[PDB]
Amino acid sequence: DPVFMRNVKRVLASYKESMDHSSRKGMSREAFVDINEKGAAWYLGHMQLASRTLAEKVKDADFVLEIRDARLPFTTGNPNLQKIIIDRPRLIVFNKAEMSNEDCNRVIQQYYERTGNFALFTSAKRSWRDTVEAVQRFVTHILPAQRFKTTANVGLVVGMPNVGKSTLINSLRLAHEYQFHREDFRRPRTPEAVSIAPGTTRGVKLVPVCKDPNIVLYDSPGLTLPGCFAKEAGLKLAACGIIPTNDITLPRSLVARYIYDVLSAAGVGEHMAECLHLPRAPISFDDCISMICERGNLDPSRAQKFLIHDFQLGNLGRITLDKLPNKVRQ
Amino acid sequence: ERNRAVDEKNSTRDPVELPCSYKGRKLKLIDTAGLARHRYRADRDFIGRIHGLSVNEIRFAHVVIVVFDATEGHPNKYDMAVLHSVAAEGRPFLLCANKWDAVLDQSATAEAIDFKIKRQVREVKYSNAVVVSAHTGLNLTLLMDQALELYDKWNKRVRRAELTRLWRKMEKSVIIPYHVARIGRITQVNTRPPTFLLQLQTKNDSNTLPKALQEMMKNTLVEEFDFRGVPIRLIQEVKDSNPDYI
Amino acid sequence: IIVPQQL
Amino acid sequence: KDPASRNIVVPDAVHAKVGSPDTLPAEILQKR
Amino acid sequence: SPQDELVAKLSDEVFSRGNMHLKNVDVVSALPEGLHSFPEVCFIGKPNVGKSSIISCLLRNPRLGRAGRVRGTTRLLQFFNVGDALLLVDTPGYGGWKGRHLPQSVAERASAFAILFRYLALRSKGPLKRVYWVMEATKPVQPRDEEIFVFLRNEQIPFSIIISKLDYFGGDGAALRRQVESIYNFLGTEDVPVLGVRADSSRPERCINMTALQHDITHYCTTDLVRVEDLSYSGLKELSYAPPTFDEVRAVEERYPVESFIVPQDDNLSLQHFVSLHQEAKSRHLAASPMAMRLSTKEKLGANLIGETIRTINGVCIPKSMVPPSVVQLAAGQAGSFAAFAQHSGANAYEEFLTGDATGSGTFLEATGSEPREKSMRRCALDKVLKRYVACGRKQRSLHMQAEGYMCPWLAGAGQQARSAVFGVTRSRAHAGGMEVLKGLKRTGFGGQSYSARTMKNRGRSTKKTGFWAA
Amino acid sequence: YLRHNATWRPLFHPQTTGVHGGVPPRQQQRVMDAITWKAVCFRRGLLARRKGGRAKFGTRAAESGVWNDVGGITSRVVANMEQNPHPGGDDFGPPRGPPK
Amino acid sequence: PHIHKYRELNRWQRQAQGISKWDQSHSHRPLPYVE
Ligand SMILES: Nc1nc2c(ncn2[C@@H]2O[C@H](COP(=O)(O)OP(=O)(O)OP(=O)(O)O)[C@@H](O)[C@H]2O)c(=O)[nH]1
Ligand SMILES: Nc1nc2c(ncn2[C@@H]2O[C@H](COP(=O)(O)OP(=O)(O)OP(=O)(O)O)[C@@H](O)[C@H]2O)c(=O)[nH]1
C-alpha cells in the first residue's frame, strides 16, 4: 500500500445520493430555513412584510453589509433595501464575479459608485477573512470617528444563507468563541463562565469582527429569503445552485431547458458545443442532451445533470442571468 | 529619620500620621504597620491587634499605597489580596515596588509585576505600579503625583447625558448572553467613590443583573472615563409601584 | 460492579 | 480565447415581461 | 576558562542529583508550562539513530530511556527532568517506521509528527534552549533530512548536530572528516557545531565523548543567565519562562495542520514525489473506473477527487483525498484544539442542520411508521440500567467560556492591555514577546491554577468523589 | 395508568425515608436481586468481549494449546544455549592451545 | 454538630449520587498530589 487508494475507493463507492438534488421532496429547505440565536427556523412570508423590521434594523445599525451573488445580483439582493431610501452606507459583496459577466459587473460597480454605496466584486476563491479585511477598510475610510472609544461600529449583514452570509457568520462566531474558550494565563482569571449546551446548532445574534477598529455585525435571520418564488426566479436560483433541484416540482429537465434557451437566445450554439465537447452545434435541447449522452452508457438524466453542473461551475462562459434596470444602465 | 525603620520584623506597631504639603495640597502621610495572614496572627493575639489597627486606618484613608518588596519579583498573593480589600472599602489603590535599587534583573521583575496586575479579576487589574527606592529616592515625586491623580479620579464626576449616550451605544456593541431587564437610565448618584445608579425597566426584585454584566459595565466606565485605580459602585434600582395605581 | 438501589 | 472564459450577452427577449404570470408569485394570481 | 569551569561544575552538580520521567506530550495544549517550566533541550532525528539511547545514557539508566531495534519506539514527546533543573525532550523519529504494527498507524504517526514540529516552531524562543539534530554515522543525506533543515531554516531555529553510532567508524578519523564534510556540503555552513558521540547505557566503558554532551547542554541552558549568582545552582533553578500567547499558538497550528504530517513508508521518496504518485494513480483510477465516469466534475470537487490548501513542511500541497478519515477523526478528537471545539459547538450550523434534517426522519416528524410490538417500559428501564451502570454510557456536558471576554473582546477582562502598568522603568518598554523570562515560577506559579492540561489525576468527568454515572 | 396517576400509594416508615427511600427493604432486596443477576450476566459478556473470547481465559482458545503449561515447576534454562564448541569447561579432555 | 458538606444529603441521596459515606472519612491514604 504505497498510496492511500483504499480510502479513495471507499469514498468513491459512496455516490448513491447527491446533496444538490432531491428525489422525493417537493419543498426545499434552502428557501425557508435560516439560523438565529435560538436555532434554525422556517420564515414564512415575503420580504415586503418584513420591510419595516428591516428598515428599523438598518436605522439601528451604523452601516450595512449586503452579500449577493454576482450572477443573480438583483434576484439575490433584498428588494426592501432597493425600495426604501436608507441613509446608512452599505457595502455590497458580489460573489462568483469571475463566473458572472464582466461588462455587467463593471456597469453595476459604476452605478453603485455613482449612487454612493460601495460595491465589491470578489472571486469564488476569496475568503471570509478577505471580506473581513474589506469591511475593515470600509469602516476605517468611510465611517466617521465615534465619540466613545469603548463603543463599536455596528453593521447589519443582509443576505441569503446560501451565498455566504451563513458561512461568514458561523466562522466569525466560532473564532470568537474559541478565542475565549481556550485558556490563557495572561488574561484575568474571572470566575464567570458561559455554558455551551452540546448537540445544539449554536446560532449567534451579534458577532465582533475586530478589536482595534471595533467592528461588530448584527445578522438578520429571516429578512432576506426567496421563500415562495416565481417560475423564472426559481429557474434562475436552481441554475445558479441556490435552491435544490426537486425531482417532483422543479425538474432538471426544466432548469436545463431554461439554461439551453438563455444560451441559444444569441448566437452561442457553436460556443456551447465547443464548451461541452460536442461534434456539432446543437439544434435542439433534446439533441444536445443526446450528444452529451453520446460523448455512451449515461442517461439523459445524467446528461441534464452534467449540463447543469457545467453551467454552475462556469464551463459554458460568463453570464449574468438578471436583467439590469434602466437606472443601472444609465 | 522620622519613624523607626529597622531590619527587624513587626517593628511598627502604632500608625503614625504626619500632616504634609505637596505642591500646595494638604495631605496626611499615614505610616501603618505591616499586614499579616490569618494563619500567622491566629496564634498571636498581639499581632492580630496590630493588624486590626492597620486595617482600621485603611477604612478611613483617602488613597492607599500598597508597598511590596520588589526583590521578590512578582507581588505576593496577600499583596494582591490587600489590593482587593482596598477596592472593597472604596479607596483608590496604588501598587508600589520598593527596594528597586537592590533589584538585579529589573527587566524580568517589571514584567513579573505587570503580569500579576493584568491577571487580576476585579478593577485591581487597572492599577498602576511605581518602582521606588526608599534609600536613593527613586522618582518619589512620580509616586506622589499619581497619589494625587487617584484622588482626582476619586472625586471625578460624570454627566448624566454622557452616561446615557454611552450605554445607548454600548448595548448594541456588547453581547448579553443572560436574560436580563433593560437598563433605562444610568446616573452617577454619589462620588468618592463614584457610585452609579442603574434603573431597570422591570418591577420584580429578583431581576438583578448578573455579576458578569456588573463587571462588564464597571470595566466600560473605567476605560471610558479614566476611572483607573479607583473602585466603582453600582446600585440597581427596580421600577417601583405607584401608590395610587389607577 | 456497583448498582444503586433503583426503586 | 478560452470558450469557458468568454462572456455571454443575454438579450432582452428571454427575460419575461413585467406583470407576466411566470414573473408574479402564484399567491398574487391565486388571490386575484 | 573561567566560564567553562563554572558551567562544568554546574552540570556535574545538577546531573548528580538524579532524574525522573516527567510527562509525555501528545497535544499542544498539555505542555510542561507552569510549575514544571524548566529550560528544555530536545533531540530530533530520523528513526533508529540513537535519540532515546543517548537520553538513557545521559540519564544513567537503560530501562528509563526505552530503546529498541524496531523503529517507532518513541511516538510522542518524552520529557525527562534531570536534577529538577533541566528538561531533556525525547522526540519521535521523522521517517518510515518499519516493523511496528501498531493499529491506527497513520493516525498515530500523524499525531506524533504534529506535536513534534508544532512544539519546535512554538517554543523555539523558550524554554527550548537548544535543538540537537541526531544523525547516523555513515547514513547518507535523505529527503527526510532535507525536510528537517527546510523546517529549521524557515523557523530560524539554531541547532547543533550530534553524530551518533560513533563505533561504526571504528576510529576512522578520515571517514568522520568526510562525513562532516558531506554534512557541511548539504547544510552549507562551516561554523555549525558538530559533536560525535556514541551511547551505551549497558556498559559505561563503551561510551566515548559522552560526558562532554551534558556539559554542552548545560552551557546552552545557562546562556540566558547574566550574573554569576544566576550561574550558580540556585540561579538555574529559579530560571523559568512564561506561557505562549493565544496569537502565536494559533498561527503555528494554522500553518502546521495535523493533516499535513503524512510521510511515505520509505525514506527515499520526497514529499513532492509522494504526492505526485498519488495524483498519477488517482487520475488513472478515475479514467478507468466506470462508476467514476458516472459522476460529474462538480460532484468530484465535492468528493475532493479531481481537485484552504494544506501545505507541508517543504511547502508542497496535499489534496484532501490523500488525507485518510482516521486522521480527520484524530484532529477532531484532540482535546483543547479548535477542531474539537468546532465539533462541539458546530463546524457549520447551517450545513450541519440540513445534513441532520435529511439523514433523519424529519425535523417535525415524530413517531412515524416506515412505508410486531414496541419495546416495553420494563425493557427500557432494564436497558437504561445496563447502559448507565454496566456499559458506563454517559451523556455529553457543556464547555465553558470566559464571560468577561465573550461579552466584549476589547476590554481589560479579555487581556491584551497595551498600557504599561509599571511606572519609572526604561527596560519594560523594550522587553516584549509572547513568551518572556519569569524567575521563580517553579516555586510560586501563576497563582491559583498553575499546572497545564493532562497533568493532575481525576479531573473533570473522571472524578472519584461521586462515581462514574454521576459525572 | 391508574397505578401511576390516580392511586394513593403510602410510604414505608417515612421517619427513615432518607435511608430506604420509602420502599420496604424486603421489596428492595427482591428488586435488587433481579437487577444484580441481570447486571452480572451482562457484565460477564462485556468482560469476555473486551478481553477477547473468554473472560478468564482471554484470547487463549480452548481448542488451541494448553491452558496452564506449568505443572509444578518448569526450568526456563536450556542446555547449551550458548552453542559453544566445547562446553566441557575451560579445561576438559584434550588441551586447547599451546601452554604458557 | 458537623462540618462536612454532604450532611445535608441523606443516606439515600448519597448512595444515589454515588458518594462514599462521609462519616467514614479515612485519611490513611494520601491525596494524589503531582510529585
Ligand atoms: N536595598 C534596599 N533596602 C531597603 C530599601 N528600603 C528599605 N530597605 C530595608 O528594608 C527594611 C524595611 O524596614 P522598614 O522600613 O521598617 O519596613 P516596614 O515595612 O516598616 O516593617 P514593619 O514596620 O515591621 O512592618 C529596612 O530595615 C531597610 O534596611 C531600599 O530602597 N533598598
Ligand atoms: N552501535 C551502536 N548502536 C546504537 C547506538 N545508538 C543506538 N543504537 C542501536 O540502535 C537502536 C535504535 O536506538 P533508539 O534509542 O531506539 O533510537 P531512536 O531514535 O530512539 O528510535 P525511535 O524511537 O524509533 O525514533 C537501538 O536499539 C540500539 O541498539 C550507537 O551509538 N552505537
Ligand SMILES: [Mg+2]
Ligand atoms: Mg515600619
Ligand SMILES: [Mg+2]
Ligand atoms: Mg526513541
Ligand code: NA
Ligand atoms: Na521593619
